[PDB]
């Protein structure tokens, strides 16, 4: 028996996340996932000037927004772009607690 | 503060440090009572999620039953409120706890 992940789970919210290497979800609800196999998911969408961020739990056996989850086993929510007409769409999935609170578009590097 | 407590909780669970888990659980329960009494139900749900994990790890059935009780109170309030994500979260947490309390 596996204790489920804890995830941000605000569903779809308006967001200020834009032109940033990483963003905090600004979601005030951390839920236990219902099912032990579920992972955390974040979906960032920009349609014209309207930015949304969706935070949920999801079973990676299933598509989400008709896309297959990528590297759901990763502890970090690494955003990747998907092809969606009429908007900019990025998604990530991850398997550490509250990992969809810290959405990563790019890392910082020591040089 | 709560992000750091979660990090510390998971480090302790991973390493078998039951004493740290028990200490963090006590802190979470205090934070939960404060959030609940202030009517900050999103925060209360959030804290409760963490407390349920900690109490589960150490097998603290009595605390799990206390958490179920406070979650049911939160649900009673949110049923009236029209914040669907919060209501769904409290309900999701109740179903998880009901496996162990």
Numbering used by the authors:
A (entry chain B): 45 to 155
B (entry chain A): 23 to 123
Structure paper excerpt:
We focused on five-helix bundle scaffolds, with three helices forming the concave interface and two providing structural support. We reasoned that a set of concave helical scaffolds with shapes tailored to interact with a wide range of convex Ig fold-containing targets could provide starting points for the design of high-stability and affinity binders to immunotherapy targets.
We further optimized the most enriched design, 5HCS_TGFBR2_0, by resampling the sequences of interfacial residues in the bound state using ProteinMPNN25 and filtering the complex models using Alphafold220. Four of the most enriched optimized binders obtained after several rounds of yeast display selection were produced in E. coli. The highest affinity binder, 5HCS_TGFBR2_1, was found using biolayer interferometry to have an affinity less than 1 nM for TGFβRII. We determined the co-crystal structures of 5HCS_TGFBR2_1 with TGFβRII. The high resolution (1.24 Å) X-ray crystal structure is very close to the computational design model (Fig. 2c; root mean square deviation (rmsd) over Cα atoms of 0.55 Å over the full complex), showing 5HCS_TGFBR2_1 binds to the TGF-β3 binding site on TGFβRII utilizing the concave surface as designed. Helices H1, H3, and H5 which form the concave binding surface interact with TGFβRII, and the most highly conserved non-core residues are in these helices. In H1, N10 hydrogen bonds with TGFβRII D142; in H3, S46 and S49 hydrogen bond to the backbone atoms of strand S72 - S75; and in H5, N93 hydrogen bonds to the backbone atoms of I76. A hydrophobic patch composed of F48, L50, and I76 on TGFβRII critical for TGF-β3 binding packs tightly on a hydrophobic groove formed by L6 from H1, M50, V52, K53 from H3 and V96, K99, V100 from H5. Design of such extended grooves and pockets is nearly impossible using small globular miniproteins; the high affinity binding and crystal structure of 5HCS_TGFBR2_1 demonstrates that 5HCS scaffolds can indeed be used to target convex binding sites. Dose-dependent inhibition of the TGFβ SMAD2/3 signaling was observed with an IC50 of 30.6 nM.
